[PDB]
Amino acid sequence: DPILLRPVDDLELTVRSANCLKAEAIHYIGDLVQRTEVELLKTPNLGKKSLTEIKDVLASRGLSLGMRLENWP
Amino acid sequence: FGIDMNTDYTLEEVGKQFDVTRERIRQIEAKALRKLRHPSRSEVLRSFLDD
Numbered sequence: 001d002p003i004l005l006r007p008v009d010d011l012e013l014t015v016r017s018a019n020c021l022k023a024e025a026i027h028y029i030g031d032l033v034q035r036t037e038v039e040l041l042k043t044p045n046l047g048k049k050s051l052t053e054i055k056d057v058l059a060s061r062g063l064s065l066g067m068r069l070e071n072w073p
Numbered sequence: 074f075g076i077d078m079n080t081d082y083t084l085e086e087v088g089k090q091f092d093v094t095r096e097r098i099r100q101i102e103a104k105a106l107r108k109l110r111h112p113s114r115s116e117v118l119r120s121f122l123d124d
Contacts, residue, residue, distance in 0.1 A: 010113050 020046045050062025
């Protein structure tokens with residue numbers, strides 16, 4: 001989806017979630033939806049509230065985990 | 074800015090009502106401007122730009 005290649009800038013996340021994204025550098029929301037909840041909790045310094053907010057920002061625009069894209073970007 | 078009031082308040086007079094010495098007030102203005110800077114929050118305001 002064209003919005004999946006939209007970055008974390010339009011995701012409208014915290015500054016802490018931006019710290020985590022720079023620490024991970026996942027550019028597209030379609031690559032990030034490919035990951036799961038415990039997989040996101042693999043990241044350091046990113047806790048339960050962080051993944052909670054991430055699920056919220058994904059529920060905003062129909063995004064969620066498990067969607068495995070291919071030929072992306 | 075001067076929305077819904079006859080000014081145009083300045084940084085010292087603004088931060089008086091927020092008790093900041095105009096530096097944190099500058100920072101707060103900058104944060105609000107950065108937030109509204111985002112697309113999906115200012116696409117309409119983008120359309121208001123003429124060029």
